[PDB]
């Protein structure tokens, strides 16, 4: 309990202070607690297509970041091949 409590308080306050760029410590947390103001949403007319998040993900993942896709294929090959080697005893 003492260590749980100390760890809770410190880890929470640090995980909240970390996201800000102010130099004074206490203000880094008081900035995280500043969730006070509303975000305006304006409407423009420049988007012409019906692109959604999944289409964008496909476009960048298969064009701009192809290498990560062609490495995730090998991660999945590990997901196939390691569990077999571990479970399946190739005695023959």
């Amino acid at each position: 309990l003492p260590l749980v409590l100390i760890s809770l308080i410190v880890l929470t306050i640090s995980g909240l202070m970390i996201y800000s760029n102010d130099s004074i410590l206490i203000n880094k947390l008081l900035e995280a607690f500043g969730n006070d103001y509303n975000t305006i949403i304006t409407q423009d007319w420049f988007n012409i297509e019906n692109t959604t998040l999944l289409t964008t993900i496909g476009n960048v993942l298969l064009t701009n970041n192809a290498f990560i896709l062609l490495v995730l294929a090998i991660v999945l090959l590990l997901g196939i091949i390691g569990p077999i080697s571990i479970t399946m005893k190739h005695k023959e």
């Binding site: 260590l3 100390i6 760890s7 410190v10 880890l11 640090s14 410590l25």
Partner: protein
Amino acid sequence: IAHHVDKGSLYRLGPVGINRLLNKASYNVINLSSNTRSSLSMNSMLILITIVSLLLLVLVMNVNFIIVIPVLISILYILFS
């Protein structure tokens, strides 16, 4: 001279004293991950201690650095005594 110095304090500030000093410090370093009953929760608690200690140590040494020094002397004692 020959006994109390050449074979006394000058072996203590040297082979004999360093040997005893390292005997203890090594036996306290390794008797740290004490229980082999579960190596997982222990090393897990060691993560939590280290992360917390570094967050708090950096906090102290931001505000003043001549205060964290004894914290580190004592930590070395706790780890090596």
